[PDB]
């Protein structure tokens, strides 16, 4: 249950009808998302614009009650504002109640191939170029397994399979896709962070990879291999060596990644 409070006007910091939801990050992150994955979907569905802020931001600068550090990100007090029509807000409210009962997450579908000469498998990876307006925990370029996030009402595996296709053009069958758990590592200051659900699936080693089918320009592609292999960054050089500039994808071993980080 979400209790909304109607406001007469927005506060000055937010320069339509306005409602407020006073809650915790444990719930607020489900209607927002680090990159507004869910906020944008809510806007798409209802026209309602969502804004979030920590209610007591000074507490986020504390290391050590009722006025010191928060124990966990989940405990962070969050004030959510909704701007829209009465009808949009009515509809958006309904969607949020459903969302906080779902568990919207990031998904990663680890596509892997087996090499004859090796017991360690190779993982398909991409490098996503991130926007200039991004939370501080996200680097300029994310090296990642394929996969994005669950849409509202979407099941985990369904989302993994759909977003694998969006990033790589690869179609896998659900019966070959295996969930393998989740990771969720965060701190109170990064209260927006969400769990990541993992899956694995084997593909044949000679499978044809097309690359991103959706927003392809948000991924590294068509770099200058000669130039990039002169980068001071070990990942850049491994990327120039192993990635296909036409697809923005590389087959990589975790052990090789570990050796680069030393």
Numbering used by the authors: 77 to 90, 94, 96 to 144, 156 to 353
Sentences from the paper on this structure:
The 5′ ends are processed by a pyrophosphohydrolase complex termed the PPsome, which is composed of the so-called mitochondrial edited mRNA stability factors 1–3 (MERS1–MERS3). MERS1 was shown to be the factor responsible for catalyzing the 5′ processing event while MERS2 and MERS3 activates its catalysis. Interestingly, the MERS1 Nudix motif (KWTLLYERYKEAAIRTLWEETGI) lacks one of the key metal ion coordinating acidic residues, which in MERS1 is a threonine instead of an acidic residue.
Apo MERS1 crystals were grown and the structure was solved using the MERS1–GDP structure (after removing the GDP molecule) as a search model in molecular replacement (MR). A clear solution was obtained and the structure was refined to final Rwork/Rfree values of 18.8%/20.9% to 2.30 Å resolution. The apo MERS1 adopts a different crystal form with distinct packing compared to the MERS1–GDP structure and as a result we did not see the fortuitously bound helix in the apo structure. Comparison of the apo and GDP bound MERS1 structure revealed that the N-domain and most of the C-domain have the same structure; the two structures can be superimposed with a rmsd of 0.9 Å for 260 corresponding Cα atoms. There is, however, a notable difference between the two structures at the base of C-domain near the GDP binding pocket. Specifically, in the apo structure density was absent for the region encompassing residues 354–380. This region contains key residues involved in nucleotide binding, including Arg356, Tyr360, Arg364, and Tyr365. In fact, the RNA is deeply embedded in MERS1, raising the question of how it gains entry into this binding site. This appears to be explained by the apo MERS1 structure, which revealed that a key part of the RNA binding region is disordered in the apo state. The binding and stabilization of the single-stranded RNA may thus occur concomitant with the folding of MERS1 residues 354–380.
